[PDB]
Nucleic acid binder design. Structure first.
Length: 242
DNA sequence: TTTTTTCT
DNA sequence: AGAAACAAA
């Protein structure tokens, strides 16, 4: 039921989500690697551009983000659009819908050019603004999957380069996609957006932090490195969702 | 079809 | 709103 899931997620806490994000999450590892090989502004711009083409992949997400990170390390990037025009058609893990994806990057390039270091700090302090602003530049609904996850991925990148932590806003949801629809169906007949926003609000853990916890646990990532109390609560969530 | 999107 | 975009199994 929602109440038991929210209770356990509340005990895991933002602290538990942050532990998984920073120690286990392979997209965070990929971003940390790239953050050492390119300047911080370009790094964040590339992370957002990459999120916006991270749909309908031909590989798992963790394979794709590592491909991205290793490709761009050390590169001299000027136009993000020109860089993706070379990168995407030769990638292994993102071969579908490339013309459409490239046009999204072309459309967002002007907005990306506003991301000075200071503007990045301002958005990390107000990620709801970033969320709305990315959507506005693309002419789309901010509720959409790739706009939400571009904020999530921006949050990882900013945390690394600014060496400080702000939690994701409570108002940014886990958005619908096939995998959250499938998981949620196992647990409830409620629609996912409403279900997970209720759990987020009851637990005190914003939805995007809940997203960090769900997928490693479902995919069998080991929780053994967590200290004993957190480990127990992670193990309790695995019993509910797997 | 199944593993998000544009266009308007 | 919903057809069409594109690769693989």
């Amino acid at each position: 039921g929602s109440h038991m899931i929210a209770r356990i997620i509340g005990e895991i806490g933002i602290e538990g989500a942050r532990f998984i994000e920073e120690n286990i999450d392979e997209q965070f590892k990929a971003l940390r690697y790239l953050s050492k090989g390119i300047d911080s502004e370009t790094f964040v711009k590339l992370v957002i551009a990459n999120s916006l083409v991270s749909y309908q992949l031909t590989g798992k997400g963790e394979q794709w983000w590592w491909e991205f990170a290793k490709y761009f390390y050390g590169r001299d990037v000027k136009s993000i659009y020109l860089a993706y025009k070379e990168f995407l058609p030769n990638s292994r893990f993102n071969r579908r819908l490339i013309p459409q994806k490239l046009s999204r990057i072309r459309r967002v390039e002007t907005f990306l050019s506003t991301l000075t270091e200071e503007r990045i700090e301002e958005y990390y302090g107000d990620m709801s603004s970033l969320w709305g602003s990315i959507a506005r530049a693309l002419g789309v609904d901010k509720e959409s999957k790739t706009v939400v996850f571009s904020v999530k991925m921006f949050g990882y990148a900013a945390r690394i380069v600014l060496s400080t932590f702000n939690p994701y806003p409570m108002e940014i949801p886990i958005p619908e996609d096939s995998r959250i629809v499938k998981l949620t169906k196992k647990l409830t007949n409620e629609k996912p957006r409403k279900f997970w926003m209720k759990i987020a609000r009851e637990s005190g853990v914003p939805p995007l932090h809940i997203d960090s916890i769900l997928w490693p646990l479902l995919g069998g990532a080991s929780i053994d490195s967590a200290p004993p109390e957190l480990r127990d609560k992670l193990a309790e969530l695995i019993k509910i969702i797997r």
